[PDB]
Amino acid sequence: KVEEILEKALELVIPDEEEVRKGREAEEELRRRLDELGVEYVFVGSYARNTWLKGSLEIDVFLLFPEEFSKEELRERGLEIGKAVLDSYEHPYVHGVVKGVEVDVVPCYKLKEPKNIKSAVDRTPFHHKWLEGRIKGKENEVRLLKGFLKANGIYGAEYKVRGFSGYLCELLIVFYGSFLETVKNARRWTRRTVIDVAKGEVRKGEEFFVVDPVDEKRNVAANLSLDNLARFVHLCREFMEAPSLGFFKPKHPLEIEPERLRKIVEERGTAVFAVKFRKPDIVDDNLYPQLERASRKIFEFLERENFMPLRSAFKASEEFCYLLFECQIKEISRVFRRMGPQFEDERNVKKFLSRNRAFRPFIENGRWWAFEMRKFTTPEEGVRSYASTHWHTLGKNVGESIREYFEIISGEKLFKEPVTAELCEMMGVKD
Ligand SMILES: Nc1ncnc2c1ncn2[C@@H]1O[C@H](COP(=O)(O)OP(=O)(O)OP(=O)(O)O)[C@@H](O)[C@H]1O
Ligand SMILES: [Ca+2]
Ligand SMILES: [Ca+2]
Ligand SMILES: [Ca+2]
Ligand SMILES: [Mg+2]
């Protein structure tokens, strides 16, 4: 059955004649313009090796240069070849569109074989040279891997996904020969697994590490999060166990009427709430690490204060950001135990006892203790206190935003916000 599903899978991963139409057109036009400027360039794209996934067409033309400043000479070439130009972020490249297709124009050094400069963009040409001859013919094998990963939300190395980059996908296919062979062997992958392509071997190491043929110190799966690696391995065991075209299909968002969520949550008996604030104007690769950090800090705070957090999640929309939380403790006693000094310490004892308190401190196991009052008794109130005076620990941009404004939302109001998918996923809700 397997080989019959992978066959139907191809119709989901391979590009349709009208998009492979935009590709060829743009490429032809783009070279024309680039040749008229007499520029030294090379298509290093997934497009350049026909390995790009259905519906994800994009070109990456790298301009080759020596010297030091190629920031402006590129600004020129780019702005002069792209019908429309924008500028993403020694970093600055030109993202435009040409004949309707997204085009990245990056400047690098035509290098005399290895030993780059503040290496980063300069390796890309080599990555391309190393993959071009070895991946020929296995294009679709690659499109299967990616299509497989994308359907399960773990394709892409950007911080929002922390999954499998494309390069990685192609290295893996070169190493094993085919999608199927990849999944079959991926079932035995561990967190200490090292896939060294250059030496055609697999050994044990400190962490999952796919060595880059071009640079043996660079881990091509650096951004792949442990959990996503663990998710791929599991998906692989699950696919072999019972292959199905549904693995190459995107899962459908849980349609949840706000009243069925309130039911699940009262049934779980937990405290569900979110921290809402204005999304700062920063790029995803900057925002996401901050949203993860913030979510972690507030979670650790919740642990410390004993509200026993179960799990957290975050969500970024167009205007706002939410840090979702679920704690097992909805309310905690006002009173708590303050550890005092050892009965021996005559001074720290006189000091500890001079403070006025509603109740009398006591000795337990040779040490003084005192009952005091918390300044909050619910995880929601605690977070309001924390987000109010410790916003500086939630990331430079997020923290700053939460400092200006934010609100703790729970109940139905929380359900009205666009965090349902995340909410459900966080609590492990099913169909
Ligand atoms: N070092 C690089 N190696 C390969 N592709 C690169 C590199 N740098 C930029 N790219 C581009 O990144 C985009 C993402 O895909 P990638 O190149 O990783 O190949 P892929 O994953 O096999 O193809 P696709 O991403 O379309 O599924 C493509 O447009 C590709 O040209
Ligand atoms: Ca994600
Ligand atoms: Ca994910
Ligand atoms: Ca209260
Ligand atoms: Mg690109």
From Swiss-Prot:
Binding site for CTP: 46, 49, 127, 146, 155
Catalytic activities: a tRNA precursor + 2 CTP + ATP = a tRNA with a 3' CCA end + 3 diphosphate; a tRNA with a 3' CCA end + 2 CTP + ATP = a tRNA with a 3' CCACCA end + 3 diphosphate
Residues the entry annotates as binding Mg(2+): 58, 60, 104
GO biological process, one term: tRNA surveillance
Presence of keyword Nucleotidyltransferase: yes
InterPro entries documented for this protein: CAA_C (IPR048833), CCA-adding_arc (IPR008229), CCA_tRNA_nucleotrans_2 (IPR042090), NT_2-5OAS_ClassI-CCAase (IPR006116), NT_sf (IPR043519), NuclTrfase_I-like_C (IPR011068), Polymerase_NTP_transf_dom (IPR002934), tRNA_NucTransf2 (IPR015329)
GO terms, molecular function: ATP binding; CCA tRNA nucleotidyltransferase activity; CCACCA tRNA nucleotidyltransferase activity; magnesium ion binding; tRNA binding
Alphabetical list of Pfam families matching this protein: CAA_C (PF21133), NTP_transf_2 (PF01909), tRNA_NucTransf2 (PF09249)
E.C. numbers: 2.7.7.72
Keyword Calcium: no
Result, substituting residue 49 to A: High decrease in both AMP and CMP incorporation
Domain of life of the source: Archaea
Residues involved in ATP binding: 46, 49, 127, 146, 155
Subunit structure: Homodimer.
Family per record: Belongs to the tRNA nucleotidyltransferase/poly(A) polymerase family. Archaeal CCA-adding enzyme subfamily.
PANTHER family according to UniProt: CCA-ADDING ENZYME
Misc remark: A single active site specifically recognizes both ATP and CTP and is responsible for their addition. In contrast to the eubacterial homologs, the specificity of the nucleotide-binding pocket is determined by both the enzyme and the tRNA.
Known role: Catalyzes the addition and repair of the essential 3'-terminal CCA sequence in tRNAs without using a nucleic acid template. Adds these three nucleotides in the order of C, C, and A to the tRNA nucleotide-73, using CTP and ATP as substrates and producing inorganic pyrophosphate. tRNA 3'-terminal CCA addition is required both for tRNA processing and repair. Also involved in tRNA surveillance by mediating tandem CCA addition to generate a CCACCA at the 3' terminus of unstable tRNAs. While stable tRNAs receive only 3'-terminal CCA, unstable tRNAs are marked with CCACCA and rapidly degraded.
Protein name as it appears in the record: CCA-adding enzyme
The species this protein was found in: Archaeoglobus fulgidus (strain ATCC 49558 / DSM 4304 / JCM 9628 / NBRC 100126 / VC-16)
Gene name as annotated: cca
